[PDB]
């Protein structure tokens, strides 16, 4: 099938050229439709020092149909569900909606964007959306949003130690 | 001074730019509009996991000679 060749190619290209702060691996080698994403929060952000885990699941017809992106790590964010599912336009049926030209490198870059600048117009979590808008509008005077972010990050150190990963 | 930086589009295209460390992000998007016609308000530039803010400068991010930025678009 074209799927399996397509996926194998994006894999080698992602491993030969990573997206900074993301690491790509198969859950099980010899299944290309399910991936593990290791994600490292950047320095001088509230995600600093943090280690995060997500999974990608690819349909039989990829890249005709968009894959699913879900966090294993628990994340507080206007565009992330309770389940860990990311709501991002490019994963639903301009370059922000899904079509056969799109690829994984693009999805990742799009998520980084979404981590940096949440979509507060059509959020999946509006409690987090309200809280973010409050944090923003207050020019940092409100610490409620940021305190939550710090804690989850601090928690991830247990995941790193448990996985044997050294956090740069 | 003299320095070039590279900007990668979602299509794989590498755009080469002539810049100064004193240049803001706002006017590097100006640089980009000039070549690609993409309006600066929908442009987003990513470096080391960070989306750079308009009104900061390349120097404040310590972006040195020949660093490659990644472009992404946002309407809203
Ligand atoms: C509410 O703010 C949360 C936060 O930390 N936001 C940052 C952007 C930001 C930058 C990078 C990511 C980021 C990037 C990657 Cl590649 C991975 C992860 Cl987990 C997060 C997240 C947010 C802001 O610069 C924030 O520091 C600030 O100084 O206002």
């Amino acid at each position: 099938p074209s799927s399996q060749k397509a996926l194998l190619l994006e894999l080698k290209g992602l491993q030969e050229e990573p997206v900074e702060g993301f690491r790509v691996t198969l859950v099980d080698e010899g299944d290309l439709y399910n991936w593990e994403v290791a994600i490292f929060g950047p320095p001088n952000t509230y995600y600093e020092g943090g280690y995060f885990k997500a999974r990608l699941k690819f349909p039989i017809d990829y890249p005709y149909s968009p894959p699913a992106f879900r966090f294993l790590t628990k994340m507080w964010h206007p565009n992330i569900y309770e389940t860990g599912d990311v709501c991002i336009s490019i994963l639903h049926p301009p370059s922000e909606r899904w079509n056969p030209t799109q690829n994984v490198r693009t999805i990742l870059l799009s998520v980084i964007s979404l981590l940096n600048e949440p979509n507060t117009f059509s959020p999946a979590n509006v409690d987090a959306s309200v809280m973010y808008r409050k944090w923003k509008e207050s020019k940092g005077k409100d610490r409620e949003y940021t305190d939550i972010i710090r804690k989850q990050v601090l928690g991830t150190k247990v995941d790193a130690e448990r996985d044997g990963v050294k956090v740069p | 001074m003299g320095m070039q930086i590279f900007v990668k589009t979602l299509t794989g295209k590498t755009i080469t730019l002539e810049v100064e460390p004193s240049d803001t992000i706002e006017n590097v998007k100006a640089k980009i509009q000039d070549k690609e016609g993409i309006p600066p308000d929908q442009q987003r530039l990513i470096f080391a996991g960070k989306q750079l803010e308009d009104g900061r400068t390349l120097s404040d991010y310590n972006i040195q000679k020949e660093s490659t930025l990644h472009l992404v678009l946002r309407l809203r």
Side-chain angles (χ1 to χ4, degrees), chain A residues 1-4 6-11 13-28 30-96 98-165 167-168, chain B residues 1-19 21-64 66-75:
Chain A
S2 67
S3 283
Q4 197 170 330
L7 289 174
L8 191 64
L9 251 131
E10 300 200 43
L11 200 63
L14 246 1
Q15 276 160 221
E16 292 168 26
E17 186 172 322
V19 179
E20 240 190 305
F22 280 63
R23 293 168 185 176
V24 160
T25 39
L26 292 173
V27 179
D28 181 76
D31 177 20
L32 296 139
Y33 295 91
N34 297 273
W35 298 10
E36 207 111 57
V37 191
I39 294 168
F40 301 83
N44 285 311
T45 66
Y46 293 101
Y47 287 93
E48 196 174 15
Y51 162 64
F52 308 94
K53 269 181 169 153
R55 289 251 168 108
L56 276 159
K57 187 197 235 58
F58 294 75
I60 194 58
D61 53 339
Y62 182 83
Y64 290 87
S65 297
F69 191 86
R70 195 177 94 270
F71 270 100
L72 295 176
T73 306
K74 185 137 175 182
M75 311 256 52
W76 179 256
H77 194 268
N79 310 114
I80 298 170
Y81 282 108
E82 299 74 303
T83 72
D85 282 276
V86 186
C87 90
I88 166 146
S89 55
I90 107 159
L91 290 189
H92 304 290
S95 191
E96 306 180 79
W98 183 263
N99 70 81
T101 21
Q102 309 276 31
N103 54 32
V104 181
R105 167 166 256 113
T106 292
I107 296 176
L108 269 28
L109 266 41
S110 311
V111 167
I112 297 181
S113 171
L114 213 66
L115 260 23
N116 277 253
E117 183 192 345
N119 159 21
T120 45
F121 183 73
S122 48
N125 185 345
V126 345
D127 282 340
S129 209
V130 170
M131 216 161 91
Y132 184 81
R133 185 177 61 110
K134 194 177 57 165
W135 171 74
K136 258 314 191 63
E137 292 156 347
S138 74
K139 299 286 173 66
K141 284 189 291 155
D142 233 80
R143 52 179 307 163
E144 187 187 15
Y145 192 88
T146 27
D147 281 341
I148 298 192
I149 304 288
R150 291 149 157 144
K151 293 170 172 189
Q152 299 176 325
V153 170
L154 264 34
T156 67
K157 306 188 169 269
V158 179
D159 300 327
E161 170 271 309
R162 182 181 73 238
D163 286 337
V165 322
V167 189
Chain B
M1 226 304 300
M3 79 174 189
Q4 295 183 317
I5 63 171
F6 306 87
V7 171
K8 272 230 165 60
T9 63
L10 302 164
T11 64
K13 164 136 75 98
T14 292
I15 285 166
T16 284
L17 295 173
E18 293 291 326
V19 293
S22 58
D23 263 317
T24 60
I25 313 301
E26 188 166 330
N27 63 351
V28 150
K29 298 182 175 189
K31 247 99 175 192
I32 290 164
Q33 181 179 32
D34 287 344
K35 292 177 175 74
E36 314 288 333
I38 308 174
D41 67 11
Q42 42 199 74
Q43 288 178 52
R44 299 295 183 283
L45 295 172
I46 299 179
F47 186 58
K50 298 180 175 84
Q51 218 166 250
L52 316 182
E53 266 161 45
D54 311 343
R56 257 92 187 268
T57 69
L58 294 163
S59 202
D60 303 345
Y61 293 95
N62 193 38
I63 284 174
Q64 273 166 1
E66 315 174 19
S67 2
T68 305
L69 313 193
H70 288 82
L71 178 64
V72 176
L73 294 175
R74 284 267 210 146
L75 281 96

